Amino acid sequence: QVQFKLVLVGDGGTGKTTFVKRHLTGEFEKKYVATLGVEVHPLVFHTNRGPIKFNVWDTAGLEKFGGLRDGYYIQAQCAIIMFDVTSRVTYKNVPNWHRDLVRVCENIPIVLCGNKVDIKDRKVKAKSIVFHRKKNLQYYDISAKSNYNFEKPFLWLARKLIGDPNLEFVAMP
Amino acid sequence: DHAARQLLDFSQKLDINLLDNVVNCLYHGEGAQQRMAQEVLTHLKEHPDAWTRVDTILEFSQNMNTKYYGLQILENVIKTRWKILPRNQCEGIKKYVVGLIIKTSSDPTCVEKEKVYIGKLNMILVQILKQEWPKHWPTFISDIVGASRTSESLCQNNMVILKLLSEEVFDFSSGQITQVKAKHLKDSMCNEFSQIFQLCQFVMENSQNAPLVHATLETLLRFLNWIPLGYIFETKLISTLIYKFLNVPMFRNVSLKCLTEIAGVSVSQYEEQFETLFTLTMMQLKQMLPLNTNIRLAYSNGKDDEQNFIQNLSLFLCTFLKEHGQLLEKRLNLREALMEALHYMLLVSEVEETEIFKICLEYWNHLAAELYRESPFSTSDIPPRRQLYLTVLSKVRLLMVSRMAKPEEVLVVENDQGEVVREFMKDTDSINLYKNMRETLVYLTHLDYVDTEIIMTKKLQNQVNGTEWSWKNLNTLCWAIGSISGAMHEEDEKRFLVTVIKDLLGLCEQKRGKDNKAIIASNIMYIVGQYPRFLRAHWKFLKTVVNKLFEFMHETHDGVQDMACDTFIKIAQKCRRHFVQVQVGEVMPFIDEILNNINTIICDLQPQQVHTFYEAVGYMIGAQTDQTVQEHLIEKYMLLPNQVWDSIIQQATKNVDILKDPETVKQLGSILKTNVRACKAVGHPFVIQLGRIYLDMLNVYKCLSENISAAIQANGEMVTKQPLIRSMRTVKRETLKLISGWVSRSNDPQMVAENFVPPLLDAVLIDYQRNVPAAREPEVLSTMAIIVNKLGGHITAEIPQIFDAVFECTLNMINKDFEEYPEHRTNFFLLLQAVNSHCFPAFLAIPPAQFKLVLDSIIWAFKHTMRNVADTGLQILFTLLQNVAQEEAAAQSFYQTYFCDILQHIFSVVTDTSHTAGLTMHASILAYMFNLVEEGKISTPLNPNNQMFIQDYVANLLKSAFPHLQDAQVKLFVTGLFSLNQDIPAFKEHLRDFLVQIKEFAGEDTSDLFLEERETALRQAQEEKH
């Protein structure tokens, strides 16, 4: 089939890997084990018009385990940026993750996610998330634990790449 | 595949194979290959050697991966140790960096030849500039405003250069670069920007080169973020942007996002230029958009270059209209475009993409607000400012009712025990949209209920015969009606409801088939639930709605049963007062009959719904304030669960094997989950219930936690994921939620500690220990901090007994890494926060040998990467230092045997690039510690004055771990820790300002920290503590 290089970045402890794991095996990781450099797992959802394959490049958030930061971004079709709605810090650094990303790939479909929206005491109040406006990005409010807008980040990217604003995930064989 | 761990990378040169690494990292590498490929490349970066990169490009290999990688190697060398390269090498790099730039940037065929590589060299060059631009190499700018005027292959690249240089100095200076240096580099460009703006104005007025100009344009948007206003308004720039670029397809978006920034500024001074900008552009849009064209279909089918424009325009309009509502109303000769623009914000205001409709809505909420602040009264005289908008307000009032959002955001999620439940998400973005439309609409209703009621009813009459019918439509409407609740007078509301709820009832007759009669009934039930004020006055009507809900309880048709309980608990809360007190024209209060006939209302309800139903009744039982009565309303309340409960207790008391049957254990989890709900409503008076089953409830919790442990041992830990050990795992956890719950809402601490605590000491804690680690429920720690945070002083004396049972055993699970047993990590330090912040006198009544293991635990806390746990630790430390500063006796003793060591640990965290998150707590504590040094301590850490010792101890401690720091910047830094030791905002910045210096070998001597600048800033702060 057709596969695209998805680049998943964002601050540490954000939930980037816990997210991929939930899509990969439906398992929810309760513990934090900072991924080193870059772990790449293939994620496949099928649509009404055939199956798609996202070779996800889950990168490291912690500055210490950065690795080849902007080197992982090369040859990417799309991208994801993630922060934590319980840590105002994870958001404040979004412009940065964005920066280095668009300097490598200056034109790719980009999604912006806010994880842990299931936590009652939301810290990054939704009425203050306006970075993606002038940067022509798309935004969702996912929750790796509850699955709030689980596939919406992918579904959205599926269209922006194929060119079919009518694409739909189904759960076929 | 091919590459194995044995890979040469020292004292040799194997270029031809370095490629096979990157082509095995960004390519072939399916997993095992690249996992190494990245590692071998990662560990080649810090391996000290800049010159090593020369051959990577000198002997280029057409692998832009390796070259980009070699570039990172060089950028690394510059960002870390540019100050320790003898000048012979500085030029060896400088001349070579710019050399390999022109020999590839001027090449016309380098269009697709790596836009990334070309960009990297720029960043690398900009990096050199950051390390040294005003100091040495002062010609730079002039050497560009002269060498760029040569070829256009050069000019187009020098623009993306200054775009980046501007982004590094102004946009992304804070954090990445030092503080006083940023100000140096900032007003350094602002100093000779007039010399580069000449060339900018030049390339826009003349050059016909498309890419070049697009760059000159794009790379200019960044300047607008800092440049002086003069270069904009006091020159033909605002004009040249609209006339020459705004209309063309390719420069369309670029010029628009420039104006959007300009219009975001205050209008108070250049009122003329803002005026001309508006009209000059508003007309230019008429020549790019027919004022009638369907915008939604221009988006539904249009390339990316088109879609983005619509969004940016939505921004420009929301920007200008909101930031210039002043200049647009007064200036009468501008009303021309004010309406021509308000109309544009109305055509685009109907696109499918949410992120665009949120920009427009943002403005509509603003407009409806400003006109409401003027006069919050309906159309009766004539409004002054509303005139211009009355026409539009109606169009907007429609926009809202037409596209209302689902208020109740609901989702079904499975938890840790596999069981599936329904959750109502809280502050999501979706459930926030409804609140912005509701507010917007509830403004344009207080401005005229008529116009809104007209759109509402006209939508309804068409929802019946007018066959505007559709499941999504009927929904969307009932979201709008249940939106403007209490927006009108109780009278105008009375007729509006009986009008709607009667037309929908007749509509429920027309539409036949259980399928359609459901969606209709639901949208009626919801409308009612959103109008509490109405239900309270008309009891006869209310007495019916609830009864008909007791009807839908039995409707096995999907969705209905859920709606019946949702719409029920909605009313049960807001009208709790009417169910308890006697009603006029009634035998006895209603709640009674509801309890006498409860075995028929839940007759065929899902377990999850039976719970929700009880919680609903719980509120009603609550409104009954009188004690004597409320107690009987509970004995009858919890009458069914107590039959099954006593049934199982009795059935099991004879042969305790009953508690091993998958069914009877599932039911116990169902009973408790009910008590947890009723208690979650009734409150304190629920104690009579909890106290009834308490001893039994614990005797079973104990009997289960054992069977789990035994099952974990003899059969392994994979039994923890099987059906039975799941049900038992829930019964255990729920018992904790009931206890931890009730206490949270208890209001008699002493009675709690005397009666309810003691049993736990044995049945919960002593059992939490006997349990094999992989069976210890962490909810036990949480359900403990909750009763400590609550009780406080009344359990202070029992803390020793608590810790003695759950402290050292829990800590021996989480001290072997920063990962395992996550819940036990968070729950533990939450418990520690409880004891420390309330029962502090309990840390004094314990041997200094135990306390040491406690303070040693808190350090272990804020050394976590678990952003939440790491914060819990810092929370305690600060509250610890404060509670200690109360009893000078144990206080001075504390400053003695710890202060130095603590100040050492809190420093191992600061200088770590993985705790910068909870930094604000660092600065907060480090400040309190250094302010405590100027008075507090009254003894001796070591030989010596006392403060002097710390000012050195810290210094000689930093200089040691970071030897590459000249004894100047270390002296200065330590000084600041006392200067702005009472200004946490700047203190926090002074720390980050240090974490930047330690990342680079600033060389032995350079004097670039700008001492006299950072010094007269610390003295400027030390002198401000007055």
Ligand SMILES: Nc1nc2c(ncn2[C@@H]2O[C@H](COP(=O)(O)OP(=O)(O)OP(=O)(O)O)[C@@H](O)[C@H]2O)c(=O)[nH]1
């Ligand atoms: N409560 C809650 N916690 C979540 C949720 N999603 C993620 N987490 C937490 O986030 C952590 C995820 O860790 P990681 O996947 O390593 O996050 P990361 O940012 O990718 O780590 P690095 O890549 O090394 O920077 C887990 O410990 C989860 O407990 C959520 O939806 N709800």
Ligand SMILES: [Mg+2]
């Ligand atoms: Mg990760």
